[PDB]
Design a protein around this ligand. Structure first.
Ligand SMILES: CCCCCCCCCCCCCCCCCC(=O)OC[C@H](COP(=O)([O-])OCC(O)COP(=O)([O-])OC[C@@H](COC(=O)CCCCCCCCCCCCCCCCC)OC(=O)CCCCCCCCCCCCCCCCC)OC(=O)CCCCCCCCCCCCCCCCC
Ligand SMILES: COC1=C(OC)C(=O)C(C/C=C(\C)CC/C=C(/C)CC/C=C(\C)CC/C=C(\C)CC/C=C(\C)CC/C=C(\C)CC/C=C(\C)CC/C=C(\C)CC/C=C(\C)CCC=C(C)C)=C(C)C1=O
Ligand SMILES: CCCCCCCCCCCCCCCCCC(=O)OC[C@H](COP(=O)([O-])OCC[N+](C)(C)C)OC(=O)CCCCCCCCCCCCCCCCC
Ligand SMILES: CCCCCCCCCCCCCCCCCC(=O)OC[C@H](COP(=O)([O-])OCC[N+](C)(C)C)OC(=O)CCCCCCCCCCCCCCCCC
Ligand SMILES: CCCCCCCCCCCCCCCCC[C@@H](O)O[C@H](CO[C@H](O)CCCCCCCCCCCCCCC)COP(=O)(O)OCC[N+](C)(C)C
Ligand SMILES: CCCCCCCCCCCCCCCCC[C@@H](O)O[C@H](CO[C@H](O)CCCCCCCCCCCCCCC)COP(=O)(O)OCC[N+](C)(C)C
Ligand SMILES: CCCCCCCCCCCCCCCCC[C@@H](O)O[C@H](CO[C@H](O)CCCCCCCCCCCCCCC)COP(=O)(O)OCC[N+](C)(C)C
Ligand SMILES: CCCCCCCC/C=C\CCCCCCCC(=O)OC[C@H](COP(=O)(O)OCCN)OC(=O)CCCCCCC/C=C\CCCCCCCC
Ligand SMILES: CCCCCCCC/C=C\CCCCCCCC(=O)O[C@H](COC(=O)CCCCCCC/C=C/CCCCCCCC)COP(=O)(O)OCCN
Ligand SMILES: CCCCCCCCCCCCCCCCCC(=O)OC[C@H](COP(=O)(O)OCCN)OC(=O)CCCCCCCCCCCCCCCCC
Ligand code: SF4
Lengths: 174, 98, 83, 71, 318, 156, 115, 70, 105
């Protein structure tokens, strides 16, 4: 077992608690990068190496632009960190306490939330016995974006081009 | 359901609560909005990899594409607001009233 | 044709990078529809056996399905051997 | 050959898991050993805990993460 | 034995970094008609040792206005990622054999970007902030171009495994196959590693040492080590990707010797370029990639997608 | 004694590193700075001896005050000297830095940089030749070679 | 497991280097030494004030093009399919749309930094 | 002269030789004098696990043959 | 609301991706291909109301294959009982479960 997936899920939740308590965009981006890397690890354990690396790379590229924008638009004289503000520390501690309560309850018993029912057992238990051979099922399914999924490619490309046009039009000003 | 799905859904709920509770900056809200889609990506790929839905493996990529399209839209609106007011504070977006 | 020649002369003297970029892109778009080896590439991708060849239950009326792999019936990769 | 070996190994692990289940769940008031959780009688592939349920952590780890962690 | 292999991968890399410092000093000196360090040891061989001891026995200070947490983390992240990039390189056998070994290096490089950003922002000084923003722009441009160039070159290969790169380059060289992409990739690696003419984050002429202006003693040495490790790692990646060496499974030492020689040749080419050219402006660097490399990169990507199909030369998947 | 031998060897090792790796700050004020360039030049290459210019004061061990120090400039010199981390050394080069020089009786010149910073080596001349400055650097190295910080501490 | 061990080793070595750097040498800090650097004079303002970003549009275009390269990355596996013509058409379609985005921005002057 | 640069490049090359040769020697040492098995797919991993099981010593590199079947 | 242009024109825009029993690349089977096929075949052509009333057994088997809730309940029950039995020394695991056997090839 080794509980690697559960530990990484907990770190994922902690990073979300950080950037949702929202100290300042610098530390929010730091927490979001940490969460993205840990999510890459989670999906790597579950099987998807390409998907994990892709989400990590995309968020690493995206948080770079956010740093440049918060240096320009969203900065103040004394940027707030988690211990700097009472509201930020309160929200961070509340999120941490809620996550720890859920973790403890799930480990001690089969925790059924008000929304869904969760069973405390092996992520290794839920896995499948069967195997593929001499190809990666995830890689083949993603590569089927071009043979299958011609419609998805069309709508995605149109959306990207229109996004370029839109961001040029919004910032026109005048 | 395993506890992994519980953690991912809890992270999504935390990010959703972060977006709905503004503090001062619009940029922090955009970061919370980007985290929600990260959690959605992780949840969808965990579900798809577990059931061996081979053709669904392309869905998380489209999810990422429209995620960053939304991020681009938000950054453009943020620069226009900053040009108008000097800061990205949400308090300045008060000219229109209900 | 003189207008086109003058435009290409001016573009090659001001933006050779763009001239080369468009030429390479146009060659990439057009050439595959004229090359005779595209069908060969398709057949080579088909000839790769990723999964197991599940056998058919013989009904006594399948003359084109070999009884043994070495039988003359069945697909032949002799074209691929000498390629 | 590997298909035959895989089927025989899977069936043997299921049989010994069933024997251990019969030994353990003998004092349980309402418990039928080997009862399926599916209405259908079609053969259903064991998940991971039906095979490597009552086994050592080393074997469990190898079976569940050996391929992914092998670098 | 795996810990032993990790140590054998780490310690020689640091030693090679120190002697790359010495080699760059001497090569620049001889190109500038000087001798370079030749006094500290025999042919100046103890100069890196003297520099390292001096730096780590000197006093390091945290600026009064700095954010101490991100002030410390940044050199740690830089050196950690610099050492980590070496683990999937086949020489001829990788330490960690990854099915997708190239995307791992791309992701780790994109993460290695943030060390300089966080060190500059944490220092809380105007020169550091200017260097950090120069880093932002540089990473934008080189990142997009690097992604597409690597895509095309690996498309000539069949997969994302560096051992498969060796197998592909068994007979000829990817430089002979795709030299234009090789030129653009070399320029992109210069930009990625922040070497001249693209040394804009640490541009001494405009900024006083750039993003690490406030870093002193040990934390500065870690940034220097990380930069030089990145230089050597990128040159090794280029040598593997474009200058393929013959591999003999029973005597693998020959591949190691050839790989090391090609890596040293590319590193010396880096030093040569630094001695030979002036420095770009960062707006001119951004306009160089987007307006010159990106069109050619897209056209060559289309060409290298089409070429295997039209010539029936699609590489095997595995 | 064993401890005395160990501390002697250790502080010989530490002094060797500091002597053999000297990083002057990129800081020149007047005509004496041209002779620093000629010391950096191929004829008297200072890079041979491990002497390398660094722009940032945080990454410099030696401050070579080469030129006239004016009243309008003295605060900047003291500021950069303070920002240099320890151990740090000062080489005053030329008459203007040493004493007053040609401008000793002037309303706008500080009569010696030793009024502002603690100077370790004084190099005379107007300007000192590149060989004279190199001799001063070597004399500074020999002065570092005599430092016994660990030997003082052991007997402290 | 192996990759986790490698990452732990690298991080531990870097942290040990930092710890040695911050504890081995003699420390002597005061207000003047740790003040910020501005070429010898006190800074007029603060380094936390907004720093105008003259290439704000190129950053957003970079986000979109990063999405495009993410879409293009699975091409080596897509070239092993039997529908080579459909795969080629879709790959070229995506590349042509990326080129069209670049051409539109270039002609509409989105690559020119703000003055 | 320009050949005073060679000792530094020689030391750098000697340092760069160590990782690859060390990795090759360790791979051969921990795999019975043979190359480390490359398992990029589930089929190759299943082959390695079968080799471990049939070896009788819990080592996949201990290869068995005709003398073992009969 | 729903304009079935796909059905009218004979096109296929997302029906290939709607379900996991459809044509997959390299004929890779889904985890619950058999259960999904059985449920779809049961519920075809009778509408939503009759599908929910009458194919409930097939849907329950499909959901069981998807989520594995009853299976995990049984496994947790067996684990708890075994842990209780070995806590008081009333159960001794066999060597083949303790790792002292030679498995099958
Ligand atoms: C796999 C990773 C998993 C990570 C899981 C956890 C993280 C999840 C995501 C983020 C969410 C939580 C963030 C942490 C909040 C901690 C509490 C807080 O408010 O901290 C303020 C603190 C900033 O405070 P500051 O304003 O800089 O300090 C000045 C004080 O005001 C005044 O203080 P002072 O000036 O008096 O100084 C006293 C003290 C101040 O020290 C601290 O405040 C220690 C902060 C560390 C956490 C302590 C709990 O200084 C020191 O101790 C000096 C050493 C500091 C450097 C070592 C930091 C180690 C961090 C690990 O925030 C952080 O440290 C943020 C970084 C935390 C994460 C570190 C790892 C980052 C990795 C990046 C790359 C990732 C790649 C892979 C993906
Ligand atoms: C003020 O007006 C001016 C002047 O004045 C008046 C002038 O004069 C000049 C003239 C000056 C110039 C023209 C140039 C000056 C400007 C510059 C910017 C300098 C230019 C110089 C260069 C371009 C080249 C010089 C080199 C430089 C600058 C690099 C600096 C070197 C370093 C930072 C080296 C430090 C890093 C190191 C040593 C690496 C770290 C160490 C290691 C990794 C080693 C560790 C090893 C281990 C841990 C392994 C140990 C274990 C082992 C061995 C085995 C153990 C095994 C076991 C099993 C135990 C000008 C222009 C001027 O305008
Ligand atoms: C977050 C960081 C910690 C968790 C990372 C993931 C660990 C578990 C991985 C398990 C899966 C596995 O081994 O996959 C093999 C794969 C490689 O193999 P693969 O993907 O080709 O396939 C597996 C192998 N076969 C082919 C047999 C199936 O590993 C990777 O791809 C590497 C992923 C690395 C992810 C790194 C995240 C960022 C970490 C940066 C840390 C830097 C320092 C930060 C702190 C500095 C300041 C203090
Ligand atoms: C947080 C990291 C933990 C893991 C560390 C893993 C190994 C680290 C290896 C790198 C070491 C880096 C430093 C190298 C040596 C040079 C510096 C040096 O000597 O520093 C030592 C430091 C030196 O103190 P200093 O602050 O004067 O340092 C100046 C050092 N010189 C003069 C050389 C510049 O020693 C101490 O701080 C402690 C000295 C004795 C006083 C003890 C106080 C009590 C607390 C500690 C003892 C244990 C108490 C147990 C009971 C607790 C409950 C009551
Ligand atoms: C695979 C590559 C690994 C790295 C290789 C690095 C190679 C570095 C170069 C090694 C050659 C060093 C040759 C020796 C240089 C110094 C020789 C001599 O000049 O110095 C002696 C100093 O020797 C020292 O006491 C001890 C030896 C130090 C020099 C050898 C260093 C060996 C390499 C260091 C480790 C390299 C890796 C570091 C990690 C003399 O000092 P001393 O005797 O007192 O003076 C008094 C003498 N009187 C009385 C006559 C006046
Ligand atoms: C980088 C990784 C960390 C390494 C940690 C240290 C590892 C060992 C470092 C290697 C030590 C090298 C010592 C070099 C000896 C100096 C060479 C010799 O020339 O110096 C002579 C003697 O030097 C000094 O007397 C002592 C130097 C050091 C003597 C040995 C110190 C202890 C070394 C062994 C302990 C190292 C391990 C313990 C710490 C980890 C005096 O000559 P010098 O005047 O200058 O030269 C002027 C130039 N001229 C001649 C042209 C004019
Ligand atoms: C022309 C109509 C104009 C009015 C409607 C406009 C609506 C937007 C434009 C939509 C145009 C495309 C619609 C048709 C999509 C075809 C999808 C699919 O059915 O055809 C593909 C055929 O693709 C063809 O190669 C050409 C695809 C289209 C080429 C680019 C057209 C771009 C036009 C749209 C521009 C962007 C604007 C979109 C928003 C307005 C599949 O062929 P196949 O080989 O069996 O796939 C293998 C599947 N297997 C494995 C199961 C067998
Ligand atoms: C037992 C404690 C062993 C050392 C812990 C050091 C923690 C600490 O408080 O020092 C923080 C010290 C800086 O403190 P200053 O404010 O600059 O002044 C003190 C200089 N000595 O930072 C460090 O030493 C680096 C800490 C190691 C990085 C670990 C991060 C992972
Ligand atoms: C449809 C097939 C091609 C598919 C895509 C091609 C690959 C990608 C190339 C497109 C990327 C973007 C293209 C952008 C083009 C417009 C950009 C532009 O505005 O250029 C202007 C206009 O300059 C021009 O001359 C327009 C470019 C003309 C090139 C088109 C030539 C057509 C090529 C025909 C092929 C002929 C074959 C000759 C082969 C020669 C050897 C290769 C100059 O730029 P400046 O704004 O002045 O620079 C900043 C100065 N302050
Ligand atoms: C075979 C077994 C092993 C044999 C060798 C064992 C030792 C190896 C080296 C271990 C590290 C050093 C250990 C401590 C050495 C003594 C340091 C010391 O106590 O110095 C105190 C003293 C401070 O000055 P003080 O007299 O207190 O005056 C107060 C200020 N007015 O003086 C000072 O602080 C002087 C300033 C420098 C002090 C630090 C440097 C000491 C020597 C370190 C050499 C190794 C450096 C390695 C660097 C990292 C790797 C690159
Ligand atoms: S001492 Fe002479 S050469 Fe030097 S700065 Fe003064 S006037 Fe110039």
């Amino acid at each position: 077992t080794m509980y690697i997936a559960f530990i990484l899920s907990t770190i994922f939740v902690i990073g979300f608690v950080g950037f949702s308590s929202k100290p300042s965009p610098i530390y929010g981006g730091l927490g979001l990068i940490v969460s993205g890397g840990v999510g890459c690890g989670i999906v790597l354990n579950f099987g998807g190496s390409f998907l994990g690396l892709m989400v990590f790379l995309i968020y690493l590229g995206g948080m770079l632009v956010v740093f440049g924008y918060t240096t320009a638009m969203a900065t103040e004289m004394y940027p707030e960190v988690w211990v700097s503000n009472k509201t930020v520390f309160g929200a961070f501690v509340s999120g941490l306490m809620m996550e720890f309560c859920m973790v403890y309850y799930a480990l001690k018993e089969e925790e059924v939330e008000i929304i869904f029912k969760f069973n405390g057992l092996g992520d290794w238990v839920i896995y499948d016995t069967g195997d593929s051979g001499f190809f990666s099922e995830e890689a083949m399914g993603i590569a089927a974006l071009y043979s299958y999924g011609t419609w998805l490619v069309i709508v995605t490309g149109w959306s990207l081009l229109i996004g370029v046009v839109v961001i040029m039009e919004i910032t026109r000003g005048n | 359901m395993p506890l992994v799905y519980m953690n991912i859904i809890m992270a999504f709920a935390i990010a959703l609560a972060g977006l709905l509770m503004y503090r001062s900056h619009l940029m922090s809200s955009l970061l919370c909005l980007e985290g929600m889609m990260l959690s959605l990506f992780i949840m969808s790929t965990l579900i798809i990899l577990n059931t061996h839905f081979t053709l669904a493996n392309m869905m998380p990529i489209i999810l990422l594409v429209f995620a960053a399209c939304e991020a681009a839209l938000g950054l453009s609106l943020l620069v226009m607001v900053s040009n108008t007011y000097g800061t990205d504070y949400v308090q300045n977006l008060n000219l229109l009233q209900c | 044709a003189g207008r086109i020649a003058s435009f290409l002369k001016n573009a090659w003297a001001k933006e050779p990078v763009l001239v080369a970029s468009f030429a390479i892109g146009g060659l990439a778009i057009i050439l595959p529809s004229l090359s005779p080896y595209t069908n060969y590439a398709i057949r080579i991708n088909r000839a790769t056996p990723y999964n197991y060849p599940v056998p058919l239950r013989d009904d006594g009326n399948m003359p084109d399905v070999p009884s043994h792999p070495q039988d003359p019936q069945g697909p032949s990769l002799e074209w691929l051997k000498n390629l | 050959l590997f298909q035959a070996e895989k089927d025989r190994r899977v069936l043997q692990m299921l049989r010994e898991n069933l024997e251990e289940e019969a030994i353990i769940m003998k004092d349980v008031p309402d418990w039928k050993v080997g009862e399926s959780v599916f209405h259908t009688t079609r053969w259903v592939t064991p998940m991971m805990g039906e095979l490597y349920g009552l086994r050592t952590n080393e074997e469990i780890l190898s079976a569940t993460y050996g391929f992914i962690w092998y670098t | 034995m795996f810990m032993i292999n990790i140590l054998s991968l780490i310690i020689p890399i640091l030693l090679a970094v120190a002697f790359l410092t010495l080699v760059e000093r001497k090569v620049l000196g001889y190109m500038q008609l000087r001798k370079g360090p030749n006094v500290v040891g025999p042919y100046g061989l103890l100069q890196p040792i003297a520099d390292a001891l001096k730096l780590f026995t000197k006093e390091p200070l945290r600026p009064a206005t700095s954010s101490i947490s991100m002030f410390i983390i940044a050199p740690i992240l830089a050196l950690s990622l610099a050492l980590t990039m070496w683990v999937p390189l086949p020489m001829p056998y990788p330490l960690i054999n990854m099915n997708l070994g190239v995307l791992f290096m791309l992701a780790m490089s994109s993460l290695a970007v943030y060390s300089i950003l966080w060190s500059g922002w944490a220092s809380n000084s105007k020169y550091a902030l200017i260097g950090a923003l120069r880093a932002v722009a540089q990473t934008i441009s080189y990142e997009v171009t690097l992604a597409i160039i690597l895509l095309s070159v690996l498309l000539m290969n069949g997969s994302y495994t560096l051992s498969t790169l060796i197998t592909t380059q068994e007979h000829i060289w990817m430089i002979f196959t795709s030299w234009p992409l090789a030129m653009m990739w070399f320029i992109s690696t210069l930009a990625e590693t922040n070497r001249a003419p693209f040394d804009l984050t640490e541009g001494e002429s405009e900024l006083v040492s750039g993003f690490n202006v406030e870093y002193a003693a040990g934390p500065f040495a870690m940034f220097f080590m990380a930069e030089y490790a990145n230089i050597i790692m990128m040159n090794a990646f280029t040598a593997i990707l474009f200058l393929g060496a013959s591999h003999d499974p029973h005597t693998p030492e020959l591949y190691t010797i050839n790989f090391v020689l090609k890596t040293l040749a590319l590193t010396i080419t880096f030093l040569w370029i630094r001695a030979s050219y002036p420095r770009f402006r960062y707006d001119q660097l951004m306009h160089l990639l987007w307006k010159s490399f990106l069109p050619l990169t897209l056209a060559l990507c289309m060409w290298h997608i089409s070429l295997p199909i039209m010539t029936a030369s699609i590489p095997p998947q595995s | 004694s064993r401890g005395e031998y160990v501390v002697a060897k250790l502080d010989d090792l530490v002094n060797w590193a500091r002597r053999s790796s000297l990083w002057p700050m990129t800081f020149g004020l007047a005509c004496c700075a041209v002779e620093m360039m000629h010391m950096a030049a191929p004829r008297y290459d200072m890079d041979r001896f491990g002497v390398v210019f660094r722009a940032s004061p945080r990454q410099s061990d030696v401050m070579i005050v080469a030129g006239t120090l004016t009243n309008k400039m003295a605060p900047a010199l003291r500021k950069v000297y303070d920002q240099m981390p320890e151990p740090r050394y000062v080489v005053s080069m030329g008459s203007c830095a040493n004493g007053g020089g040609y401008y000793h009786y002037s309303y706008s010149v500080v009569r010696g940089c030793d009024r502002i910073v603690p100077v370790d080596i004084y190099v005379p001349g107007c300007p000192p030749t590149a060989e004279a400055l190199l001799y001063g650097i070597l004399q500074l190295q020999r002065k570092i070679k005599r430092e016994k910080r660990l030997r003082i501490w052991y007997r402290r | 497991m192996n990759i986790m061990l490698t990452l732990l080793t690298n991080v531990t070595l870097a942290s040990l280097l930092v710890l040695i750097a911050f504890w081995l040498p003699q420390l002597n800090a005061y207000s003047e030494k740790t003040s910020p650097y501005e070429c010898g004079f006190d800074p007029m303002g603060s380094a936390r004030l907004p720093f105008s970003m003259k290439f704000f549009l190129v950053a957003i275009t970079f986000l979109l093009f990063d999405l495009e390269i993410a879409l293009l990355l699975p091409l080596p596996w897509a070239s092993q399919t039997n529908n080579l013509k459909t795969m080629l058409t879709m790959a070229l379609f995506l590349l042509i749309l990326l080129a069209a985005s670049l051409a539109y921005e270039w002609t509409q002057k989105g690559l020119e930094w703000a003055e | 002269m320009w050949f005073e640069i060679l000792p530094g490049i020689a030391v750098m090359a000697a340092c760069l030789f160590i990782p690859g040769m060390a990795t090759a020697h360790i791979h051969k040492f921990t795999n019975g004098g043979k190359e480390k098995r490359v398992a990029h797919f589930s089929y190759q991993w299943n082959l390695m696990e079968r080799d471990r099981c049939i070896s009788g010593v819990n080592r996949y590199h201990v290869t068995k043959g005709l003398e073992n079947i009969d | 609301p729903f304009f079935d242009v796909q059905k009218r024109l004979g096109l296929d825009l997302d029906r290939w991706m709607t379900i996991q029993s459809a044509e997959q690349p390299h004929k890779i089977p889904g985890r619950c291909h058999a259960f999904e096929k059985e449920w779809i075949e049961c519920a075809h052509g009778i509408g939503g109301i009759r599908a929910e009333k009458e194919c409930k057994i097939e849907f329950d088997d499909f959901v069981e294959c998807l989520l594995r809730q009853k299976t995990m309940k049984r496994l947790s029950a067996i684990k708890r009982q075994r842990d209780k039995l070995i806590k008081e020394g009333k159960y001794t695991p066999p060597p083949h479960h303790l790792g002292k056997e030679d498995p099958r090839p």
